[PDB]
């Protein structure tokens, strides 16, 4: 987890994987609602237009759904019933949810 | 200009400076309206919600205003009357326009 620890210089926290695999924001802009992220979980230097929901828990979620660490809403299917093998791993959608297609 | 040429591997086109100083998108997502950019002019892997205006010319512009290469709208003051010296150069705002404050 880097969501707490933080990251070595030259890397930033990926909010999806909670690993320091991101490059980090190449600026020092003040963003009232924080920085936007790529759908794969890295911040970049553009301000969000509205706040990210602060927290998410499975207990809040509908049947068959779980939290997205990208959106902190119950956006992701719990079971995407996917039996593909991928080198790059699976694609994520715009809500940061994996679905059953290999990353190109 | 990289807006046409394109960029060497490991770098991508900065739409503001038209120099290959960007890292490039670390994905192969299809975005119907293209990728979002940081306010300093680099694409990242999140899809735009609406299209960028395709083209901008000064002739379209109000008095005292010129095109933003970020937005292709007449967003920037032509004269920000700024006589600061900055190592990092001047800040840009969310429309990609310079204004009279040194980058931290
Ligand atoms: Cl911004
Ligand atoms: Cl996206």
- The distance from CA B94 to its chain's CA centroid, rounded to whole angstroms, is 10
Instruction: Please give the method by which this entry was determined.
Output: X-ray
Same domain, B79 and B39: no
- B22 near B43, Cβ under 8 Å? yes
| Phi (first) and psi of residue A66, to 5 degrees | -140, 170
Q: Do A38 and B28 touch (CB under 8 A)?
A: no
Q: Are residues A45 and A58 in the same domain?
A: no
Of B36, B51, B66, which residue constitutes the final position of a domain?
A: B51
> Which DSSP string corresponds to A10-41?
T-B--TTT-SS-B---SS----TT-EEE-TTS
DSSP state of B25: -
A-chain residue closest to B43, CA distance: A44
Distance from CA of A83 to the nearest CA of B (A): 21
Q: With 0-12 CB in 10 A as exposed, 13-18 as middle and 19+ as buried, what is A101?
A: middle
Cα separation, B75 vs B58, in Å, equals: 11
Residue B102 to residue B91: CA distance in whole angstroms: 6
Q: Are residues B11 and B21 in the same domain?
A: yes
Taking the C-alpha atoms of residue A37 and residue A57, their distance in angstroms, rounded to an integer, is 21
Residue A47 sits in a domain whose CATH number is 2.10.22.10
Same domain, A9 and A38: yes
Domain shared by A24 and A71, yes or no: no
Closest partner CB to A45 (pick from B29, B38, B45): B38
Interface residue ranges in chain A relative to chain B, Cβ cutoff 8 Å: 23, 26-29, 36-40, 42, 44-47, 91, 94, 103-104
Q: What tokens appear for B8 in the block?
A: 């060497």
Distance CA A97, CA B11 (A): 28
Backbone angles phi and psi of A67, in degrees to 5: -60, 145
- Kindly list the distances between the CA atom of residue A87 and the CA atoms of A28, A79, A83, A84, in Å, as whole numbers in the listed order: 35, 21, 13, 10
**Residue of chain B whose alpha carbon sits nearest to that of A92:** B29
- Kindly list the residues from chain B whose CB atom is less than 8 angstroms away from the CB atom of residue A38: 26-27, 44-46
Quick one: B104 and B57 in the same domain?
Answer: yes
- Structure token digits, residue B51: 């299209």
| Residue tagged 């794969």 (tokens) | A40
Instruction: Check A94 against B27: CB less than 8 A apart.
Output: no
* Nearest one of A75, A81, A77 to A94, comparing CA atoms: A75
Same domain, A32 and A72: no
Output the CA A56–ligand 1 centroid distance in Å: 26
**Tally of domains within chain A:** 2
Query: What was the resolution (in A) of this experimentally determined structure?
Result: 1.9
Give A40-98 as a 3 state SS string: CCCEEEEECCCCCCCCCCHHHCCCCEECCCCCCCCCEECCCCCCCCCCCCEEECCCCCE
Phi, psi torsion values for B95, nearest 5 degrees: -100, 5
Distance, in Å, from the CA atom of A50 to the CA atom of A86, rounded to the nearest integer, reads 35
Q: Whole-angstrom Cα distance, residue B101 to residue B82?
A: 8
Rounded to an integer, what distance in angstroms lies between the CA atom of residue A47 and that of residue B2? 25
CA distance A41 to chain B (A): 9
Q: Among B14, B31, B51, which residue terminates a domain?
A: B51
Q: Is there a contact between A42 and B40 if contact means CB atoms under 8 Å apart? A: no
Question: What CA–CA distance (Å, rounded) separates B61 from A80?
Answer: 50
For A8, the domain range is 1-51
A53: its two tokens: 């929901």
Distance of CA B47 from the midpoint of ligand 2 (Å) = 4
């Amino acid at each position: 987890g880097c969501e707490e620890a933080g990251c070595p210089e030259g890397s930033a926290c990926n909010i999806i994987t909670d690993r320091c695999t991101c490059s980090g924001v190449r600026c020092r802009v003040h963003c009232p609602h924080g920085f936007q992220r790529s759908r794969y979980g890295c911040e970049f230097c553009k301000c969000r237009l509205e706040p990210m929901k602060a927290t998410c828990d499975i207990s809040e979620c509908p049947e068959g759904m779980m939290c997205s660490r990208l959106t902190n809403k119950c956006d992701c299917k719990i079971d995407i019933n996917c039996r593909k093998t991928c080198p790059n791993g699976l694609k994520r959608d715009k809500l940061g949810c994996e679905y059953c297609e290999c990353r190109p």
